[PDB]
């Protein structure tokens, strides 16, 4: 049809220029182009965490906590508050 | 998108087929229209109930049939429409594209896709109003299904087409106890099992978008839209959207279970679609009846519920069981909408005021609720061995409805009053957290046994999950077998014992 | 096998008559459950550890 | 950045809307509607000698 | 041009029937334009009738509407004029500079009626948005383009706190605010002008941040119906015009519903069970459904809402409080209390804290800012009631820490500049979170609590705990 | 007429609620179609106009005073009611002189709680204002320390005093 | 002259002892079963008894209360009527009353009661 | 409302008082008659000008017996008169 | 909009359009559910009982100034419209 066939036309060729042609758009004053695909693409990380998200930031897995390996202070004094303990058993 | 311009491609190509075959000379051109209504001459030959294409681009059903001005709802706004727009004949009952690829789409009246995904496939477009099947076609509940959450659940079951109904104030979350339900849909329906599966269908008639928001993001994040379609009417959504749209519901309940898998429905608040058929009704030209409320809304509420069924293995021995959803003003049990309703749906969960903010976030009235079937079609593990506990759970709430301010007359009421009331402080299965047919019976087993009644009350909101985690690291082989075994044996009892023992213990 | 582990400690309370008055003991076995607590947890909340490079790039 | 995918594809279509609405305008404004008038006796013609 | 002519035929009360010309019928809802000698009637077309006579229901009284009388279609809503231009003045909802300091030469010129946008690119994952309150800052799960109201008392200070509210979100959020007056007292419309003239927030010459768009009683019942939309397209313009988030104040859910009900019953609908009409759900919902977030920015506008009898027996205050996510107990004597802004945290309870919802850090700031003062106000109706001398050692320190949590909790008022001259002071997220940990952790317990009244973030405390505890001694 | 004078003055809208049911009546038989609690909508347009009519000018036009002084019918204390609702919000106030302090033999029994003038304050006479600040107290303490009217001899001794102290207010 | 002197007469007490406990339900909910005679507290007693007797098991019904059905014979239940106002089983438990037969069944439950409840 | 205002009266027989057991069921206090003894046989009226005072005095002691108490010896005595009656 | 349309309502329907002979014998235009409209009897005394000549008899209440309604007292089988 000539109202479907001219309309394809005007929103085909039209459409090379928004997308299929880098031609940007002359009605439009600021080319998405120089507006989405870098700065825009910063959008994405912009929600994101910058330079953070993609990046996945470096936290290794530290060790958990223990009694520094003493035996000669810790254990005497554990043993005698023990059996003050076991006074009320 | 080149797939966009393919898309328009093709359906500027089948606009123009339909434009070479308009064959429409004397279709109707609308005559005047309002408040969703559209009064048109013409369409001297058009069928009763069939949608119309209007010039707008807004469609609706056309509905009374009147002398000479066929009287068209219109299915959308009408800042776009006016007096005087062709209308076209599409020459069809208005049917909703339905079929299993629906699933995790939300679908507008009719069934236009709305969240943004597409077109979704279609097992067939059947008529919004099909008549349900009679007696011959239709079975007994013989299958039980769960309810997910604890809910009065086991107390109150919800069987192979059990048509239970619900009610409450504004933002009671009644939707929520219906999405809970729905979650269920996930310890049985996520395996692989069609015996198991209850592919649930919601229903959003009239509710803020945001609201609906809120419910796409509750499904996605629990992962429930792989089992759950949605059907939506906003509140910003035209009239008779909002009316239809129970309508398609039905027939996204048809396409699944008359295909002979057992399905279940959960239509939302109903009362919307009430008023709906209100503004429908006294907009259009037809008097109005009882309750102000259109005549027919008992009419409209049972062509919803009664196409719901458990059809017998003639059928395929496949069920919709549907859970629709009506609202009241003040928890008014007794209304035109509320009371006419409990005599269509076969159960009931009745959801206060005070407790809504007195006792319990399920708040569900449990002397209040009841449900038509309680023995057939029920949790075996509720009562094959926990029977018991059912008529316990009666006796238990007829227990506490005499502690008001009655005296001590005796100890053995006393016992039951504390035992009893720590049951209900356990009983409420929390929010979107459906875990079931695992240990339903132990809360009122132990109470009797005197296991869970010896723990304080208020203790008992962690005493009971640190039971269940027990069962399930320690009683594991006979905690999974009350899963599966779908008895709690004398000897499983006694198992069962023994970790109560541990769990005691511990 | 983790009740095995918590039944020695389980059977000791039980029979804890002359061992009641643990100050640091009951400590230390809260220690323990959290560390059960929290490896199921991550067991079960948190995804695998990889990336579902298959299909979502 | 799949979300990031999305709203661009979301503008994508919109943009695409915003150009046809030039190109539509474009449309009275050349008188191809002469040379669719044409075109519309034709489909209309074949239409009724259809049946 | 071609001005479709019309004829005044039928004006039955507020809502008037004008027949015009065959294919030139305005469609629904399109704005119409009559001129009398009183200015200007607007008229929204209502209904279709048909026999080319279109019925409407006017956005002005239509005293003084003859017969005879050629109606004209704006094709299109009613046209108001857009842009931070008239932004700051009282414009006539009529579209007029209604502010009589001179017409609002706002070039642009915005609709009403609007299409309902896209949800399918709003905020589903909505964004947390920062108000500038630390206390409605750290306790409260929230989101952008939602909506929240607990207004409470009866602008006891808080139309005051109002437009203070308007200059901190114009300020930090780079927005506009809209605090859209429908069926508003002339008396009390004068009072609140006078008073922003005082606060600044909008100045006949000084730089506006508030949006005055008030539809008041003053006029028809369909005034206040399209009245509220209209400030909603306002409001929407000029954050979409400058991607400017603009949090939204309205005069009350209440007021306009009951409007819409009004003009809803005029139409000629059946009176409803109750004290409904045929279309009581679409009047709000063609405004509030329409008013969500984007990426310029988002639009979270705030009902204000006195809780009449303090009674849930009405369904819209239901479904606005179910709106709001957390809630701010504005009790009167805790205005007195300490708090110039009294917005209590206490009532600031949701479910939206979740790990990977609401943060960690500031979940956790929520959980233990509301449990302090929940205890605090638990263990008082019992304490008290026993004695001062109940403080149990842990009911010591938590009433100190909440006493702390409470004098701290008041901000320096910025629209207050003729209130004791405090310059103006809020937080950040980033100072608001952790410094709610930190001074809940003991950070400065030991320093006396007089210190947290009047004081802002850590950022001037330290500097007034030091100056109270040195220019005095 | 008299206002934009400039003068004061105070107009008594004396029983506004049958006027509104005069309206109600009057848009039936002019077939207006009708609406919640059937008078017709318009209600609240005819009354907020005829409300809004009278404030305090400025010093722009000379300063004009009126005041209002209506009326309506508390058919039970018809809250949920459109006309007595709309008579209250419209009002600048509500004095609900509820029938039950009257029935008490009192000619001028206004209803404590209830009374909430808004902008009261700023008509307000300080001296007055001096002393009604512990009246308010005072009727507030007696409505929330009148419940336990079977348990008094074990009440506070100073709520007995408050008590009293409301009593003699 | 329908279904017997003895039954209508049992009819009528147990319908005036009923009516009797519904007029006063409002005296004994605002004060108490104390407050009131200790002949109207007797006839309050009888009559909760007597509604607690007025429910059965029924064949199809078992679904719910789980009990098989009892159909209680005419006459037998007359007798039985007659007695439980006339006192020939007063001291039997009121729950033992609920969802039986006849008072034969009344008085098996109420030894069940005894044996289990004790 | 009609009936009752054009007819000559009332035997308004509420149903708590056939339920009470008095059949026929004349809720005498609840009764009306505008004609009265007048159109009655005197033989009757000597027996019920007493009788109307008896149940109105068994009317005025129906809740003092309702409370179910004691009472001075009028009242128990028009509590046992207005039973028998 | 030169004017408003060419009616409102209606009273009459058939189109004999000439005199009227109906004075004592009637036309049953709307019979039915007990209720039935007839067209003749030009002046009969109200709540007169008139014979419908299927068999049933009947009282006429209704004397609308176009058509007179009267009850159809009996089983409405028996009437038909125009008998």
């Known amino acids: 049809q000539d109202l479907y066939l001219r309309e394809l036309k005007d929103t085909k060729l039209a459409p090379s220029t928004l997308q299929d042609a880098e031609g940007n758009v002359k009605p439009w004053n600021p080319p998405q182009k120089p507006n989405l695909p870098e700065l825009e693409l910063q959008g994405p990380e912009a929600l994101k965490a910058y330079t953070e998200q993609n990046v996945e930031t470096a936290h290794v897995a530290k060790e958990s906590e223990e009694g520094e390996s003493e035996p000669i202070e810790e254990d005497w004094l554990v043993l005698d508050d023990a059996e003050e303990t076991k006074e009320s058993h | 998108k080149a797939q966009p311009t393919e898309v328009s491609s093709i359906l500027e190509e089948r606009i123009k087929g339909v434009s070479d075959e308009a064959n429409l000379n004397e279709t109707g051109r609308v005559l005047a229209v309002g408040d969703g209504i559209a009064r048109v001459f013409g369409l001297n030959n058009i069928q009763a109930e069939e949608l119309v294409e209007f010039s707008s681009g807004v469609k609706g059903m056309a509905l009374n049939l009147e002398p000479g001005q066929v009287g068209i709802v219109l299915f959308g706004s009408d800042r776009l429409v006016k007096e005087g727009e062709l209308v076209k004949r599409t020459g069809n009952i208005v049917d909703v594209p339905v079929g299993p690829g629906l699933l995790g789409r939300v679908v507008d009246a009719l069934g236009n896709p709305i969240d943004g995904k597409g077109p979704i496939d279609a097992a067939g477009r059947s008529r919004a109003q099909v008549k349900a099947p009679g007696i011959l076609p239709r079975r007994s509940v013989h299958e039980p299904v769960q309810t997910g959450l604890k809910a009065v659940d086991a107390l109150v079951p919800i069987g192979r087409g059990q048509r239970e109904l619900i009610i409450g104030d504004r933002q009671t979350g009644k939707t929520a106890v219906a999405l809970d339900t729905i979650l269920n849909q996930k310890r049985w329906n996520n395996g692989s099992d069609e015996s198991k599966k209850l592919y649930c269908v919601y229903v959003a008639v009239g509710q803020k978008r945001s609201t609906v928001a809120q419910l796409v993001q509750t499904l996605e994040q629990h992962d429930a839209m792989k089992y759950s379609i949605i059907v939506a009417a906003t509140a910003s959504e035209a009239a008779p959207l909002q009316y239809l749209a129970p309508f398609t519901a039905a027939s996204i309940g048809e396409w699944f279970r008359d295909n002979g898998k057992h399905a279940l429905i959960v239509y939302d608040d109903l009362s919307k679609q009430a008023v709906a058929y209100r503004q429908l009704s006294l907009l259009l030209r037809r008097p109005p009846g009882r309750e102000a409320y259109p005549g027919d809304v008992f009419y409209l509420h049972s062509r919803l519920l009664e196409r719901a069924a458990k059809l017998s293995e003639k059928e395929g021995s496949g069920s919709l069981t549907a859970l629709p959803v009506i609202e009241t003003q003040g928890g008014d049990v007794s209304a035109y909408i509320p009371t006419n309703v409990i005599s269509i749906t076969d159960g009931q969960i009745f959801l206060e005021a005070e407790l809504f903010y007195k006792g319990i976030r399920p708040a569900i009235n449990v002397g209040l609720s009841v449900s038509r079937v309680g023995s057939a079609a029920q949790v075996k593990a509720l009562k094959q061995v926990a029977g018991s506990l059912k008529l316990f759970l009666a006796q238990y709430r007829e227990v506490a409805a005499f502690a008001q301010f009655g005296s001590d007359l005796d100890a053995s009421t006393k016992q039951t009053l504390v035992r009893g009331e720590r049951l209900t402080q356990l009983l409420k299965q929390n929010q979107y957290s459906p875990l079931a047919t695992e240990e339903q019976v132990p809360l009122i087993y132990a109470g009797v046994n005197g296991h869970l009644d010896g723990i304080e009350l208020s203790r008992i909101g962690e005493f009971e999950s640190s039971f269940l985690s027990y069962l399930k690291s320690n009683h594991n082989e006979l905690l999974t077998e009350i899963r599966e075994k779908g008895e709690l044996s004398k000897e499983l009892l006694a198992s069962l014992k023994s970790a109560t023992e541990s769990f005691v213990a511990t | ?57 | 950045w799949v979300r990031y995918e999305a709203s661009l594809r979301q503008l994508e279509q919109r943009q695409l809307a915003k150009s046809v609405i030039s190109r539509v305008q474009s449309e009275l404004g050349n008188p191809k509607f002469q040379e669719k008038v044409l075109q519309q006796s034709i489909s209309e013609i074949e239409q009724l000698l259809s049946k | 041009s071609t001005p479709i002519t019309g004829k005044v035929t039928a004006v039955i009360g507020a809502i008037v029937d004008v027949h015009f010309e065959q294919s030139e019928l305005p469609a629904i809802l399109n704005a119409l334009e009559i001129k009398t000698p009183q200015g200007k009637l607007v008229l929204e077309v209502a209904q279709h009738l048909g026999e080319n006579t279109v019925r409407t229901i006017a956005m002005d009284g239509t005293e003084g509407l003859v017969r005879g009388e050629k109606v004209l279609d704006t094709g299109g809503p009613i046209s108001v004029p857009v842009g931070r231009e008239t932004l700051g003045r009282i414009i006539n909802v009529i579209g007029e500079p209604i502010d009589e300091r001179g017409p609002i030469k706002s070039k642009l010129r915005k609709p009403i009626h609007a299409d309902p946008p896209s949800f399918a690119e709003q905020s589903t994952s909505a964004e947390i948005l920062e108000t500038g309150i630390k206390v409605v800052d750290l306790l409260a799960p929230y989101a952008r383009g939602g909506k929240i109201g607990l207004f409470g008392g009866a602008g006891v200070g808080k139309t005051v706190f109002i437009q203070e509210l308007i200059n901190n979100i114009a300020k930090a959020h780079g927005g506009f605010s809209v605090f859209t007056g429908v069926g508003e007292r002339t008396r009390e419309g004068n009072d609140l002008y006078r008073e922003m003239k005082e606060t600044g927030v909008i100045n006949l010459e000084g730089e506006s941040k508030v949006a005055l768009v008030f539809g008041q009683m003053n006029e028809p019942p369909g005034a206040r119906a399209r009245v509220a939309l209209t400030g909603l397209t306002i409001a929407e313009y000029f954050r979409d015009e400058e991607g400017q988030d603009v949090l939204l104040f309205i005069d009350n859910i209440f007021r306009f519903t009951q409007a819409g009900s009004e003009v809803s019953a005029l139409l000629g609908r059946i009176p409803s069970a109750v004290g409904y009409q045929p279309t009581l759900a679409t009047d709000m919902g063609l405004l509030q459904e329409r008013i969500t977030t984007t990426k310029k920015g988002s639009v979270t506008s705030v009902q204000a809402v006195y809780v009449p009898a303090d009674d849930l027996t009405d369904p819209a205050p239901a479904t606005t409080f179910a709106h709001l996510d957390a809630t701010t107990v504005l009790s009167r004597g805790i205005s007195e209390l300490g708090i110039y802004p009294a917005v209590d945290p206490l009532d600031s309870k949701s479910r939206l804290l979740d790990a990977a919802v609401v943060g960690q850090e500031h979940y956790d700031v929520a959980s233990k800012v509301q449990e302090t003062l929940q205890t605090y106000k638990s263990l008082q109706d019992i304490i008290a009631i026993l004695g001062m001398d109940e403080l149990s050692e842990q009911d010591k320190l938590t009433v100190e820490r909440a006493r702390k949590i409470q004098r701290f909790l008041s901000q320096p008022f910025a629209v207050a500049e003729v209130f004791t001259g405090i310059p103006g002071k809020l937080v950040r997220l980033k100072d608001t979170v952790a410094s709610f940990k930190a001074v809940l952790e003991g950070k400065y317990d030991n320093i006396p609590e007089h210190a947290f009244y009047m004081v802002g973030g850590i950022e001037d405390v330290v500097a007034k705990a030091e100056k109270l505890a040195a220019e005095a001694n």
Do not use: C, M
């Open chain 3, 1 to 57: 096998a983790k009740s095995a582990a918590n039944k020695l400690d389980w059977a000791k309370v039980i029979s804890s008559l002359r061992i009641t008055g643990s100050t640091a003991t009951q400590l230390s076995s809260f220690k323990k459950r959290n560390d059960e607590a929290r490896r199921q947890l991550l067991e079960l909340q948190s995804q695998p550890t990889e990336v579902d490079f298959s299909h979502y790039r």
